[PDB]
């Protein structure tokens, strides 16, 4: 279906949530350069340029800023771009207008953070 466990793509915005590769990386933003096997990325931090390889759960989305361009990485507009409206902090999801495909203009309300990340 269009629901997926793995949720990486390529040419995101995602932010370290791990200490295990060293505190240096904790919270810092990195591109994710190539996905591996689904649910591994490769992974070039945006700070020092260092490459990692790291699993799907040593990294968040980035909820970039109102105005901003968004990749939907999973759920039914998945393969789409969008977007960013605003969020909603207290349910962890957003509104974007579609900007892809057959449904470009539609506003979605409520897409969850984890179904979108920001584009580099």
Known sequence: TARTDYWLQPEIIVKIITKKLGEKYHKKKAIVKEVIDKYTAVVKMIDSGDK???????LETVIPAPGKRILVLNGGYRGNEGTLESINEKTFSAT???????LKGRRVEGIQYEDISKLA
């Open 52 to 58: 990692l390889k790291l699993d799907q759960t040593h």
């Open 96 to 102: 974007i207008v579609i900007e892809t495909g057959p």
